[PDB]
Amino acid sequence: NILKVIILGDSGVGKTSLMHRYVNDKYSQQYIGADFLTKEVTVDGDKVATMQVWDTAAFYRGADCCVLVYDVTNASSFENIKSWRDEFLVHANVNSPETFPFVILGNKIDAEESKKIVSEKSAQELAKSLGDIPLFLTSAKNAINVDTAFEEIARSALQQNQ
Numbered sequence: 001n002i003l004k005v006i007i008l009g010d011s012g013v014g015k016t017s018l019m020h021r022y023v024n025d026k027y028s029q030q031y032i033g034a035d036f037l038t039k040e041v042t043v044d045g046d047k048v049a050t051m052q053v054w055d056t057a058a059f060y061r062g063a064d065c066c067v068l069v070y071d072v073t074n075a076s077s078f079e080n081i082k083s084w085r086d087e088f089l090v091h092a093n094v095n096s097p098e099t100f101p102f103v104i105l106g107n108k109i110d111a112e113e114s115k116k117i118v119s120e121k122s123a124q125e126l127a128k129s130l131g132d133i134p135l136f137l138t139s140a141k142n143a144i145n146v147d148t149a150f151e152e153i154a155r156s157a158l159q160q161n162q
């Protein structure tokens with residue numbers, strides 16, 4: 001019952017912060033020897049699993065979902081999302097590249113409007129173009145939508161693991 005989730009994206013977008021929000025429900029501006037952190041996945045009563053979250057911080061062996069993160073205030077980080085999808089696929093040796101699941105997170109949605117660079121339309125259009133990859137806008141800092149996004153990351157990983 002072990003789900004292996006990898007998080008990729010440019011330095012600075014909030015990958016580490018997203019993991020800490022999901023695993024420990026905390027954020028510090030001030031935020032190791034562990035290749036991954038674990039969190040129990042809880043469902044509608046239902047069924048349970050352990051998620052391993054691997055931060056960029058054998059690595060690819062057994063991945064069940066890959067999360068691609070950009071920062072809505074950093075245009076280059078968004079322009080590199082397809083490159084990260086492709087980097088994963090050209091190195092991870094997944095069983096079925098056609099169906100392996102990705103999820104895209106556009107982080108720092110708490111930022112003031114004046115600092116946001118990437119539109120929601122632009123990101124929806126890219127996520128569609130790459131194969132209808134699910135897209136979530138998030139804030140690790142303010143606890144906006146990280147729960148919703150990881151519910152889909154966990155669902156995706158459960159499907160792929162089984």
Ligand SMILES: Nc1nc2c(ncn2[C@@H]2O[C@H](COP(=O)(O)OP(=O)(O)O)[C@@H](O)[C@H]2O)c(=O)[nH]1
Binds near residue numbers: 014107141
């Ligand atoms: N405003 C805002 N800043 C964030 C958010 N998530 C991370 N950051 C900041 O962005 C910087 C990079 O975060 P980090 O998690 O280290 O990014 P990584 O390099 O992708 O692991 C740190 O200064 C964070 O505190 C967020 O949701 N909102």
Ligand SMILES: [Mg+2]
Binds near residue numbers: 015
């Ligand atoms: Mg980091």
